[PDB]
């Protein structure tokens, strides 16, 4: 709730979505959510989760393959502010290949091609019926997504 997103040990970028708000995406070795769950019970939590998911897919023009692969993820809600944390399993090349068809991998792809992090590397390529999948490796342990403003985008929000 107090640590900085724009820390030197982190790779960060902020994107605008609308209604004078956006998303702050952080690649960090510091965790923000400690429960291993993501409620999504009521439609409000689901709508706010879908709104953030579709914003990243539309903005980054992503196409996530279906490899039946799962990226460990927990979410939290504090009012209208959503927090999504991915516990990244992309340390090695085989780790990236076993987690290639996930949204977090697609975000690592976006961080790589626009050079928002010099740690990410294209470690594996997987052919399929869709576009050739690129699996990216990174030493970062966590990928954090938060709905915040341009004024406060360098500071983590309190979930
Ligand atoms: C992610 O990692 C944090 C810190 O190690 C842990 O508290 C949390 O339960 C983990 N979440 C999932 C979904 O594994
Ligand atoms: C972020 O929260 C505001 C309310 O504070 C809401 O109006 C906006 O739709 C949210 N943005 C996203 C992408 O969820
Ligand atoms: C994060 O932790 C991993 C685990 O050893 C390490 O390899 C990596 O260098 C760390 N990244 C940063 C930015 O400290
Ligand atoms: C949600 O985020 C907005 C924008 O960062 C902030 O103004 C508001 O106080 C937050 N809600 C809380 C902290 O309950």
Answer yes or no: is 4 within a domain. Answer: no
Residue 138's contacts (CB-CB under 8 Å, 6 or more residues apart) are: 27, 88, 90, 91, 108, 117, 119, 120, 121
Answer yes or no: is 159 within a domain. Answer: no
Resolution reached, in Å? Answer: 2.5
Ligand 1 atom nearest residue 87's Cα: 1
CB 74 within 8 A of CB 42: no
* CA-wise closest residue to 14 among 118, 89, 114, 141: 114
Coil/strand/helix, residue 79: coil
CB 74 within 8 A of CB 86: no
Name 156's bridge partners.
Answer: none
Q: How far is the CA of 139 from the centre of ligand 3 (A)?
A: 5
Answer yes or no: is 157 within a domain. Answer: no
DSSP string, 101-114: SSHHHHHHHHHHHT
**Dist CA 120 CA 49 (whole Å):** 26
Coil/strand/helix, residue 22: strand
* Ligand 3 within 6 A of CB of 31: no
Answer yes or no: is 33 within a domain. Answer: yes
Answer yes or no: is 2 within a domain. Answer: no
Residue 148: φ, ψ to 5°: -145, 180
The ligand with the least distance to the CA atom of 28 is 3
Residue 50: φ, ψ to 5°: -65, -40
Please report how many Cα atoms fall inside a 13 Å half-sphere around the Cα of residue 11, on the Cβ side. 19
- Number of domain units in the chain: 1
The domain of 57 spans 11-148
* CA-wise closest residue to 39 among 88, 71, 6, 84: 84
CB 108 within 8 A of CB 60: no
Name 135's bridge partners.
Answer: 124
Q: How far is the CA of 67 from the centre of ligand 2 (A)?
A: 31
Residue 76's contacts (CB-CB under 8 Å, 6 or more residues apart) are: 33, 35, 82, 83, 85, 159
């Amino acid at each position: 709730g107090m640590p900085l997103s724009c820390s030197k040990n982190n790779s960060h970028h902020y994107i605008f979505v609308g209604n004078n708000s956006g998303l702050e995406l952080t690649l960090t070795n510091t965790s923000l959510l400690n429960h291993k769950f993501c409620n999504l019970s009521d439609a409000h939590k689901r709508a706010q989760y879908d709104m953030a998911l579709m914003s990243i897919v539309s903005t980054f023009h992503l196409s996530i393959p279906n490899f039946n692969q799962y990226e460990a993820m927990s979410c939290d809600f504090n009012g209208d502010n959503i927090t999504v944390q991915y516990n990244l399993s992309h340390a090695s090349a085989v780790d990236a290949a076993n987690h290639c068809g996930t949204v977090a991998n697609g975000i690592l792809e976006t961080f790589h091609k626009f050079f928002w992090s010099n740690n990410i590397k294209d470690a594996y390529q997987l052919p399929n019926q869709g576009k050739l999948a690129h699996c990216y490796s990174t030493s970062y342990q966590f990928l954090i997504i938060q709905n915040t403003t341009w004024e406060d985008h360098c500071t983590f929000s309190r979930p």
